[PDB]
Design an enzyme around this catalytic site. Structure first.
Site, short mmCIF file in Angstrom:
data_model
loop_
_atom_site.label_atom_id
_atom_site.label_comp_id
_atom_site.label_asym_id
_atom_site.label_seq_id
_atom_site.Cartn_x
_atom_site.Cartn_y
_atom_site.Cartn_z
N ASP A 78 -5.71 -7.53 -3.14
CA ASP A 78 -5.78 -7.56 -1.74
C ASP A 78 -6.75 -8.74 -1.26
O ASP A 78 -6.33 -9.71 -0.94
CB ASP A 78 -5.98 -6.43 -1.54
CG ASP A 78 -5.80 -5.97 0.21
OD1 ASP A 78 -5.17 -6.75 0.55
OD2 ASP A 78 -5.44 -4.55 1.13
N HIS B 70 1.12 -1.22 0.37
CA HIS B 70 -0.07 0.19 0.41
C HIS B 70 0.55 1.66 -0.11
O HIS B 70 0.97 1.48 -1.35
CB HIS B 70 -1.09 -0.11 1.19
CG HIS B 70 -2.18 -1.12 0.56
ND1 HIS B 70 -3.33 -0.46 0.41
CD2 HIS B 70 -1.95 -2.17 1.19
CE1 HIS B 70 -3.91 -1.40 0.25
NE2 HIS B 70 -3.24 -2.70 0.72
N1 LIG Z 1 -6.62 -4.75 3.78
C1 LIG Z 1 -6.42 -6.06 4.91
C2 LIG Z 1 -5.93 -4.77 6.04
C3 LIG Z 1 -4.36 -5.67 6.63
N2 LIG Z 1 -4.73 -7.32 6.68
C4 LIG Z 1 -5.75 -7.55 5.86
C5 LIG Z 1 -5.69 -7.19 5.39
N3 LIG Z 1 -6.62 -8.11 3.84
C6 LIG Z 1 -6.77 -9.52 4.63
N4 LIG Z 1 -5.98 -8.85 5.74
C7 LIG Z 1 -5.01 -9.84 6.89
O1 LIG Z 1 -4.50 -10.96 6.96
C8 LIG Z 1 -4.74 -12.07 7.19
C9 LIG Z 1 -3.70 -13.18 6.01
O2 LIG Z 1 -4.42 -12.82 4.65
C10 LIG Z 1 -6.21 -12.63 6.61
O3 LIG Z 1 -6.52 -12.87 7.85
C11 LIG Z 1 -7.05 -10.78 6.95
O4 LIG Z 1 -6.81 -10.87 8.80
ZN LIG Z 2 -2.89 -6.96 1.81
#
Ligand SMILES: Nc1ccnc2c1ncn2[C@@H]1O[C@H](CO)[C@@H](O)[C@H]1O
Ligand SMILES: [Zn+2]
EC number: 3.5.4.4
Length: 349
Positions: free
Chosen positions: A292, A235
Site C-alpha cells: 500500500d 482491501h
Molecule cells: N491507504 C490509502 C487509502 C486511500 N487512498 C490512498 C491510500 N494510500 C494512498 N492513497 C491515495 O492514492 C493517491 C495515489 O497513490 C495518493 O496521492 C493518496 O491520495
Molecule cells: Zn491503496
C-alpha cells in the site's frame, strides 16, 4: 530471515506512497521547497506513522512531500525508476503500481494541487514520464512492472480524463483504473464522474480495481462490485461483515488486495478483533498481500509477510498459494500472465 524468501507478486502499492526519503530531500533542496525536516531520519519520523491514525489523518502525510515531486519531470521519472529498484530487491517479480496522474501535474489540472504555479507538466505528461522510468527500471533490474491510474474520490471531474489516459497508454505500462482517496466521503463511490468513467472502462475493456471496504461499510464494497463493476477489491476487509455479500464474493472468486500492516496503521483493522485476512486464509479466498504505502507505514513487503507469519499463523504453502492467485488475478494479458505463472511454479518447486 524474510518470512517468504521466494518471488512475489504485488498488486497494491501507491507510487507516491513509496518514495525514498532521500529523493524527497534531494528535490526539496534542489527546488528550494520546504520540508518538515532536513534529515532522512527526522524526515522519516514526520512522514511516517508509528501508531494508528485515521484515513483522513494518514492521507495528510502526503502534504509534506508531494510538492517536492509534483511538477518536476526529472523527479517524476526518477521516482518511477527507483520504485522498480525497490521492488526488485524485495524479491518481487511482477508489480502493479498505482498513482494519480493529476496529483503530480502542474498544468491543465482543474484544481491546481499543492498550490503550484502553472507549468508544462500535463497529466498526460506524467503518465508518459512514469512509463519511461518504469521501463528503464525494467531493463535495469529484470522485473515486470505495469501501472494503474487512480481516480480520486474527491475529484470526480478528473475521472473521465483518467479513463482517456488509460485508453491511450493501454499496456504501455498502463493496465487498469482505480478509485482511491478518502473513502469516508459519503456517497463518493456514486458520484457521476466516477460512475461514468467506470461505465466507460467496462465498454472499452479497461480493467478495474476499486479501493473499498478498507474503512467503509459493506455497502461500499457492494457498490464497487455491482455498480462500478470492479474486477478486484482493494482491501475489502469489512466485506466479511455482510455474510451474504461475502459468501457471494467468495463464490465469484473476487480477488481481495490485502494490505495487513496498512490496515492497522490507518485504523481499518481494530487490533482487538481478528484480521479479515485470517478469514480469507481459512476460507481459501482469492487474495494477495501488499504494501500500500511503504514510505508512510515505514515498511517493506517483508513487514506484511512477517506480520501474517508471526500473528495469524501463515505458512509457506499459503504464501505460495496467495501469490499464485495474485498472478492469476493480475491484469496482464493472457500470454504474459501465463509466463508469470510459468515462472512462479518453476521457482516454487
Ligand atoms: N491507504 C490509502 C487509502 C486511500 N487512498 C490512498 C491510500 N494510500 C494512498 N492513497 C491515495 O492514492 C493517491 C495515489 O497513490 C495518493 O496521492 C493518496 O491520495
Ligand atoms: Zn491503496
Amino acid at each position: 530471515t524474510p518470512a517468504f524468501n521466494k518471488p512475489k507478486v504485488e498488486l497494491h502499492v501507491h507510487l507516491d506512497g513509496a518514495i525514498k526519503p532521500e529523493t524527497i530531500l534531494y528535490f526539496g533542496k534542489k527546488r528550494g521547497i520546504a520540508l518538515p525536516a532536513d534529515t532522512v531520519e527526522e524526515l522519516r519520523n514526520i512522514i511516517g506513522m508509528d501508531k494508528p491514525l485515521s484515513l483522513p489523518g494518514f492521507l495528510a502525510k502526503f502534504d509534506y512531500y508531494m510538492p517536492v515531486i509534483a511538477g518536476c519531470r526529472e523527479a517524476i521519472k526518477r521516482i518511477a525508476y527507483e520504485f522498480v529498484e525497490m521492488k526488485a530487491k524485495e524479491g518481487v517479480v511482477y508489480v502493479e503500481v498505482r498513482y494519480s496522474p493529476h496529483l503530480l501535474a502542474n498544468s491543465k489540472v482543474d484544481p491546481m494541487p499543492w498550490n503550484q504555479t502553472e507549468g508544462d507538466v500535463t497529466p498526460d505528461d506524467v503518465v508518459d514520464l512514469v512509463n519511461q522510468g518504469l521501463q528503464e527500471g525494467e531493463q535495469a533490474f529484470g522485473i515486470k512492472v505495469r501501472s494503474i491510474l487512480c481516480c480520486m474520490r474527491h475529484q470526480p471531474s478528473w475521472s473521465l480524463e483518467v479513463l482517456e489516459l488509460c485508453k491511450k497508454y493501454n499496456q504501455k505500462t498502463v493496465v487498469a483504473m482505480d478509485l482511491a482517496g478518502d473513502e469516508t466521503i459519503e456517497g463518493s463511490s456514486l458520484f457521476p464522474g466516477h460512475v461514468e468513467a467506470y461505465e466507460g472502462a467496462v465498454k472499452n475493456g479497461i480493467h478495474r480495481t476499486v479501493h473499498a471496504g478498507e474503512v467503509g461499510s459493506p455497502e461500499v464494497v457492494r457498490e464497487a462490485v455491482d455498480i462500478l463493476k470492479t474486477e478486484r477489491v482493494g482491501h475489502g476487509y469489512h466485506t466479511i461483515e455482510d455474510e451474504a455479500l461475502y459468501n457471494r464474493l467468495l463464490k465469484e472468486n473476487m480477488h481481495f488486495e490485502v494490505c495487513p500492516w496498512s490496515s492497522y496503521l490507518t485504523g481499518a483493522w481494530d487490533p482487538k478483533t481478528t484480521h479479515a485476512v485470517v478469514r480469507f486464509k481459512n476460507d481459501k479466498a482469492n487474495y494477495s498481500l501488499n504494501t500500500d504505502d511503504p514510505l508512510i507505514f515505514k515498511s517493506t513487503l517483508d513487514t506484511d509477510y512477517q506480520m501474517t507469519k508471526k500473528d495469524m499463523g501463515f505458512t509457506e504453502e499459503e504464501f505460495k498459494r496467495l501469490n499464485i492467485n495474485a498472478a492469476k488475478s493480475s491484469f496482464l494479458p493472457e500470454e504474459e500472465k501465463k509466463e508469470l505463472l510459468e515462472r512462479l511454479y518453476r521457482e516454487y518447486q
